[PDB]
Design an enzyme around this catalytic site. Structure first.
Site, mmCIF file in Angstrom:
data_model
loop_
_atom_site.group_PDB
_atom_site.id
_atom_site.type_symbol
_atom_site.label_atom_id
_atom_site.label_comp_id
_atom_site.label_asym_id
_atom_site.label_seq_id
_atom_site.Cartn_x
_atom_site.Cartn_y
_atom_site.Cartn_z
ATOM 1 N N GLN A 1 1.118 -1.375 2.472
ATOM 2 C CA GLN A 1 2.489 -1.187 3.031
ATOM 3 C C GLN A 1 2.536 0.197 3.698
ATOM 4 O OE1 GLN A 1 4.649 -3.309 2.670
ATOM 5 N NE2 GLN A 1 3.378 -4.635 1.339
ATOM 6 N N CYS B 1 7.837 -10.423 7.937
ATOM 7 C CA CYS B 1 8.069 -9.461 9.011
ATOM 8 C C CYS B 1 8.294 -10.195 10.270
ATOM 9 C CB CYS B 1 6.801 -8.664 9.301
ATOM 10 S SG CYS B 1 6.711 -7.404 8.161
ATOM 11 N N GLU C 1 11.568 -6.046 7.928
ATOM 12 C CA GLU C 1 10.985 -6.837 6.831
ATOM 13 C C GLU C 1 12.043 -7.587 5.960
ATOM 14 O OE1 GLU C 1 7.663 -5.360 5.169
ATOM 15 O OE2 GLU C 1 7.294 -7.242 4.177
ATOM 16 N N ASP D 1 3.823 -14.086 0.947
ATOM 17 C CA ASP D 1 3.908 -13.001 1.919
ATOM 18 C C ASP D 1 2.828 -13.246 2.897
ATOM 19 O OD1 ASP D 1 4.372 -10.528 3.302
ATOM 20 O OD2 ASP D 1 3.642 -9.327 1.573
ATOM 21 N N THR E 1 -0.002 -5.392 -4.580
ATOM 22 C CA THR E 1 1.282 -4.643 -4.618
ATOM 23 C C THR E 1 2.347 -5.236 -5.553
ATOM 24 O OG1 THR E 1 0.937 -4.192 -2.313
ATOM 25 C CG2 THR E 1 3.100 -3.423 -3.083
ATOM 26 N N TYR F 1 -0.813 -14.674 -1.276
ATOM 27 C CA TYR F 1 -1.140 -13.739 -0.192
ATOM 28 C C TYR F 1 -1.027 -12.318 -0.764
ATOM 29 C CZ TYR F 1 0.354 -18.010 2.678
ATOM 30 O OH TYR F 1 0.488 -19.267 3.203
ATOM 31 N N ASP G 1 -4.773 -20.588 1.479
ATOM 32 C CA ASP G 1 -3.505 -21.298 1.315
ATOM 33 C C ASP G 1 -3.604 -22.818 1.656
ATOM 34 O OD1 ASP G 1 -3.578 -21.092 4.147
ATOM 35 O OD2 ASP G 1 -1.461 -20.478 4.237
ATOM 36 N N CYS H 1 5.607 8.285 19.081
ATOM 37 C CA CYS H 1 4.558 7.588 18.322
ATOM 38 C C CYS H 1 4.206 6.298 19.010
ATOM 39 C CB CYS H 1 4.950 7.249 16.854
ATOM 40 S SG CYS H 1 6.746 6.965 16.431
HETATM 41 N N1 LIG Z 1 -5.038 -18.830 5.068
HETATM 42 C C1 LIG Z 1 -4.842 -17.730 4.237
HETATM 43 N N2 LIG Z 1 -4.858 -17.865 2.904
HETATM 44 C C2 LIG Z 1 -4.635 -16.859 2.045
HETATM 45 N N3 LIG Z 1 -4.492 -15.578 2.403
HETATM 46 C C3 LIG Z 1 -4.495 -15.287 3.742
HETATM 47 C C4 LIG Z 1 -4.664 -16.347 4.740
HETATM 48 N N4 LIG Z 1 -4.651 -15.713 5.942
HETATM 49 C C5 LIG Z 1 -4.431 -14.385 5.752
HETATM 50 N N5 LIG Z 1 -4.332 -14.161 4.453
HETATM 51 C C6 LIG Z 1 -4.001 -12.915 3.778
HETATM 52 O O1 LIG Z 1 -2.530 -12.900 3.826
HETATM 53 C C7 LIG Z 1 -2.079 -11.607 3.458
HETATM 54 C C8 LIG Z 1 -0.809 -11.365 4.295
HETATM 55 S S1 LIG Z 1 -0.244 -9.692 4.014
HETATM 56 C C9 LIG Z 1 0.103 -9.726 2.274
HETATM 57 C C10 LIG Z 1 0.478 -8.312 1.893
HETATM 58 C C11 LIG Z 1 0.421 -8.074 0.394
HETATM 59 N N6 LIG Z 1 1.545 -8.750 -0.373
HETATM 60 C C12 LIG Z 1 0.535 -6.597 0.137
HETATM 61 O O2 LIG Z 1 1.373 -6.155 -0.677
HETATM 62 O O3 LIG Z 1 -0.183 -5.778 0.711
HETATM 63 C C13 LIG Z 1 -3.255 -10.679 3.836
HETATM 64 O O4 LIG Z 1 -3.718 -9.907 2.687
HETATM 65 C C14 LIG Z 1 -4.356 -11.623 4.414
HETATM 66 O O5 LIG Z 1 -5.586 -11.320 3.821
#
Ligand SMILES: Nc1ncnc2c1ncn2[C@@H]1O[C@H](CSCC[C@H](N)C(=O)O)[C@@H](O)[C@H]1O
Length: 398
Positions: A245, A360, A392, A333, A276, A271, A319, A62
């Site tokens: 995921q 990760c 993870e 996350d 999820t 985030y 953020d 893969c």
């Molecule tokens: N400055 C920022 N502020 C807020 N969100 C952001 C960011 N930069 C990236 N992201 C978001 O951060 C996330 C990291 S991945 C988060 C995964 C999520 N918990 C799940 O279960 O699928 C992404 O969805 C991306 O859109």
């Protein structure tokens, strides 16, 4: 002579064996090898040709699966040890429940010489099936060859970067048995794919950018608009352009675990992506607000809230600006960059009693916990990514 010969004693952090300084991909500790030619790469010497003289007892395709010649128990050992060097202490790696058939999304490049993955950016590895995705990929790939041949579809010439059809991206709900196929093309016209596939959803996406990406703008779809994956009692809508995921069986452990680690009633899913963790927690009666800067993720989080009959509130926010005032636990996350200094600032200023950090990238994680006015209280690593070097982390911070 002997400078190009020896036994591999270790793998570096990316999973490459090291022989007397030479990086040797796809080797194992205890292999005895002869390096026939090296290149320079990022100013390190990499074996480009080598011969295996004696097999490591740690040995068992893969894209990205650079640990796949290693038995699975040793992949888990390499991960424990990687995490122990990095974090300076010891952490359980929970194994993935399935190590084949676990992956719920794959991108197959569709190219002039074959369907498969890149080796060598020019050179495709042609495959008939993808075992990490599982048996659906065999059927998808044989149906795809009939489609292309009967319809005379223009496929990607990767030397020249030309051609209409570039990826088939397959997605499947492991617990629902729903399957989605997405065709990623350049501009032009895709013939009706209906009578060639027997899947729940067929998408056509056009990538109008100059990048080589295995997604584009949704041009059209046939069958279901969404399929579903189900993690315990929670359904999630799957769409070609939203993140989910990638290992559905470890994602079950991941959501179970975060919900064991949280404290209180007030949860910020920061985030959140498509919701999820917020929505699995809303369904176990927590009080949930989540934020993500990606607009389409938020739209999917809201569609997911609707189908799950919960009440959880998702909004678009950065953020650099989200407030964390008023919560019992913040789940973070973050993307690769880690926590924005301003959000760490505001978390150290408001100090909610629990942060659950999902990561990760254990080094950015440790960078951020040392910036936080917080202590690792619990930590568990989950093997979300069999056959690759990534892992993870789920940590309860206090
Ligand atoms: N400055 C920022 N502020 C807020 N969100 C952001 C960011 N930069 C990236 N992201 C978001 O951060 C996330 C990291 S991945 C988060 C995964 C999520 N918990 C799940 O279960 O699928 C992404 O969805 C991306 O859109």
């Amino acid at each position: 002579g002997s400078h190009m010969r020896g036994v591999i004693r270790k793998l570096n952090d990316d999973g490459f064996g090291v022989l007397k300084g030479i990086l040797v991909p796809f080797s194992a500790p205890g292999d005895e090898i002869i390096v026939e030619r090296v290149e320079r790469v990022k100013k390190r010497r990499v074996a480009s040709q080598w011969k295996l003289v004696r097999s490591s007892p740690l040995r068992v395709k893969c894209g990205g699966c650079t640990l796949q010649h290693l038995n699975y128990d040793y992949q888990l050992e390499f991960k424990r040890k990687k995490l122990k060097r990095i974090l300076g202490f010891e952490v359980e790696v929970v194994p993935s429940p399935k190590i084949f058939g676990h992956r719920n999304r794959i991108d197959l490049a569709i190219t002039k010489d074959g369907i498969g993955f890149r080796e060598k950016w020019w050179k495709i590895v042609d495959i008939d099936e993808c075992p990490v995705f599982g048996k659906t990929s065999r059927e998808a790939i044989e149906r795809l060859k009939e489609f292309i041949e009967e319809e005379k579809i223009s496929v990607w010439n990767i030397k020249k970067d030309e051609g209409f059809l570039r990826y088939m991206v397959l997605r499947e709900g492991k617990f629902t048995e729903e399957v989605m196929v997405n065709f990623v093309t350049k501009e032009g016209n895709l013939p009706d794919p209906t009578n060639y596939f027997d899947f729940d959803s067929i998408y056509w996406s056009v990538n109008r950018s100059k990048s080589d990406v295995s997604y584009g703008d949704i041009e059209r779809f046939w069958g279901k608009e969404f399929i579903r994956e189900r993690l315990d009692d929670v359904d999630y809508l799957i769409h070609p352009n939203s993140f989910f995921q990638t290992n559905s069986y470890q994602a079950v452990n991941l959501v179970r675990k975060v919900s064991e680690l949280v404290e209180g009633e007030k949860i910020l899913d920061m985030y959140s992506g498509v919701g999820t963790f917020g929505i699995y927690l809303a369904k176990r009666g927590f009080n949930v607000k989540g934020f993500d800067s990606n607009e389409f993720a938020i739209e999917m989080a809201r569609r997911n809230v609707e189908i799950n009959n919960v009440d959880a509130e998702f909004e678009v926010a950065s953020d650099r600006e989200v407030s964390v005032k008023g919560f019992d636990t913040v789940i973070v996350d973050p993307p690769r960059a880690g926590l924005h200094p301003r959000l760490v600032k505001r978390l150290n200023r408001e100090k909610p009693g629990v942060i659950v950090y999902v990561s990760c990238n254990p080094e950015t994680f440790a960078r951020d916990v040392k910036m936080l006015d917080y202590r690792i209280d619990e930590i568990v690593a989950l093997d979300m990514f069999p056959h690759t070097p990534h892992v993870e982390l789920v940590a309860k911070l206090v």
